[PDB]
Design a binder for these strands. Structure first.
Ligand SMILES: [Zn+2]
Length: 48
RNA sequence: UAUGUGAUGGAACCUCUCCGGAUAAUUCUAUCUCUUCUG
């Protein structure tokens, strides 16, 4: 996935913003995942 | 009743300090009671 960037505001009427503070895990990359046919993890996340 | 590519809040002991204490022989004698009718 990506797990970066984003524009979370933790509210619709305030800036504040919501961000991570811990470490994100990794796994080796296999197959092709893109906009047309996202992998199940990206489909759940909806990063595209 | 959220709004979405990002939430270690299991991420914090109502904790700390303070003699239910102090004083006292289970002992012992003076009355009580008010209206009587000329005396
Ligand atoms: Zn993917």
């Amino acid at each position: 996935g990506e797990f970066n960037g984003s524009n979370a505001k933790v509210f619709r009427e305030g800036k504040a913003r919501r961000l991570r503070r811990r470490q994100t895990l990794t796994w080796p990359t296999k197959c092709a995942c893109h906009e047309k046919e996202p992998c199940p993890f990206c489909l759940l996340l909806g990063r595209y």
